[PDB]
Design a binder for these strands. Structure first.
Ligand SMILES: Nc1ncnc2c1ncn2[C@@H]1O[C@H](CSCC[C@H](N)C(=O)O)[C@@H](O)[C@H]1O
Ligand SMILES: Nc1ncnc2c1ncn2[C@@H]1O[C@H](CSCC[C@H](N)C(=O)O)[C@@H](O)[C@H]1O
Lengths: 241, 241
DNA sequence: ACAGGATCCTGT
DNA sequence: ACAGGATCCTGT
């Protein structure tokens, strides 16, 4: 259902389907949570993880923050649909101080609500000629009313203790797809992950996996094959074991 | 809402507002209907009027015509996004035969869908390097599904029997604005109209009036004053009594 | 400056 | 999750 923040490639729509293919588990470990549309909406306990400390931090802070808190920032900087300088300044400040909340308030004003953090910790998204709508408070609330069951981590899937009896939903950057986070992926990672996956299968530990096998001419050769070894659903495919 | 044909200065947007300021009436008499965005969308009975026979006729014919009818013409002349000769020929034909339907099919291909009839009955708009889009069928349908309540007339507002108990929305050529039909207006007409309006006020007969009081340096001096005597809304002003 | 498509947004 | 109305965008 509803995620925490607009996230490119959210699972606000497929989730239901996917949920029709999930098992039992002592702990849901979302290896790639990003938006959180998946974590917030799956019986816990949940280990929300994402290799981007910035956004995880923001989540960690969002924990003890009120809507009123957010507003006080908008009014503090005089943000709005047209406030361009302000946004810059707000961005300016977040870059220097790195206060999560700032980042949070930030994105709502970024070009297409997209959080884009470069390799120096700076927020580069341009002004979105926007502000907060009504999905803003609704999304926010969901998180609040469901963040309890979640345990965040800003680890790289590589080093993430997978404690037996836990389902591991994994929606990694689609190799054959565009998106800010594809700047983190490499063919190697693809390999690693898969191995790392076969490995979880070797411990009875079941998992879920979403991806694209072929999109816009290209196709994920190596993955297309690797999938055969397991079940695949077509809705975009969910390769689960 | 949706008019019958793209018309410079349509009221597809203001209408709602304007309707928020309308009274009851036994007959809606649209003195300047042009595009029809106003007639088709106002509880009838409606007297759609415009001093341009050609476009009114087109309407009168449109009455008993089907979309399929329109297409048969397009295929008949082999019209398209690039068919320049054809357009000319089609125009060529409409000029000679003066068949409304031809004119109808015509404009969809004219430069900016603009119907421009000179003082000799000829269509002069140049080829628009276009053809029919999505809005073409949609606009068409609206008319069909709403033309019933309308009674057309190709009269000059001067001689138009205003039968008591009728609201008279009047969107005449804006004196201080450019547009093909401004070739019909003169400062005198402005005077006349206004008198003609005060006169309807003298019979309890209420009316609606849209115009621009000041636009691009210029201002409708004489009108700006005349308006004070009545109510004025700012959205462009609707001077109603 | 406008159309008309694209997408956004909101309530439901 | 949708409808479709309200906005954003962009080729003329
Ligand atoms: N090398 C890497 N290791 C771990 N996580 C990574 C990674 N590269 C990217 N990621 C994270 O995984 C995300 C995949 S996209 C998010 C999908 C999620 N279902 C959603 O609704 O949010 C990336 O945005 C990034 O946050
Ligand atoms: N002397 C005159 N008598 C009557 N109608 C006239 C006129 N001079 C111009 N007109 C008509 O008045 C129209 C005003 S245009 C208004 C268009 C209409 N609001 C719609 O929404 O499309 C002109 O296009 C022209 O057709």
């Amino acid at each position: 259902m509803l995620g925490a923040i607009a996230y490119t490639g959210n699972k606000q729509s497929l989730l239901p389907e996917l949920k029709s293919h999930f098992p039992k588990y002592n702990r849901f470990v979302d290896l790639f949570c990003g938006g959180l549309s998946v974590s917030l909406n799956v019986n816990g306990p949940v280990l929300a993880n994402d290799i981007q400390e910035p956004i995880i931090e923001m989540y960690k802070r969002l924990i003890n923050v009120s809507w009123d808190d957010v507003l006080k920032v908008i009014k503090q900087y005089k943000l709005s649909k047209t406030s361009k300088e302000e946004f810059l300044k707000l961005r300016e400040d977040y870059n220097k101080t790195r206060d999560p909340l700032l980042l949070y308030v930030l994105h709502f004003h970024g070009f297409s609500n997209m959080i884009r953090i470069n390799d120096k910790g700076n927020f580069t998204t341009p002004f979105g000629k926007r502000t907060i709508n009504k999905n803003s408070e609704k999304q926010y609330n969901h998180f609040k009313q469901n963040c309890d069951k979640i345990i965040f981590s800003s680890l790289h899937f590589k080093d993430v203790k997978i404690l037996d009896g836990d389902f591991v939903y994994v929606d990694p950057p689609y190799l054959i797809t565009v998106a800010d986070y594809n700047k983190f992926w490499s063919e190697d990672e693809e390999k690693d992950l898969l191995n790392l996956l076969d490995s979880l299968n070797d411990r009875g530990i079941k998992f879920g996996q979403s991806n694209v096998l072929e999109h816009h001419g290209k196709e994920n050769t190596l993955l297309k094959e690797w999938s055969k070894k397991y079940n695949v659903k077509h809705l975009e495919v969910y390769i689960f074991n």
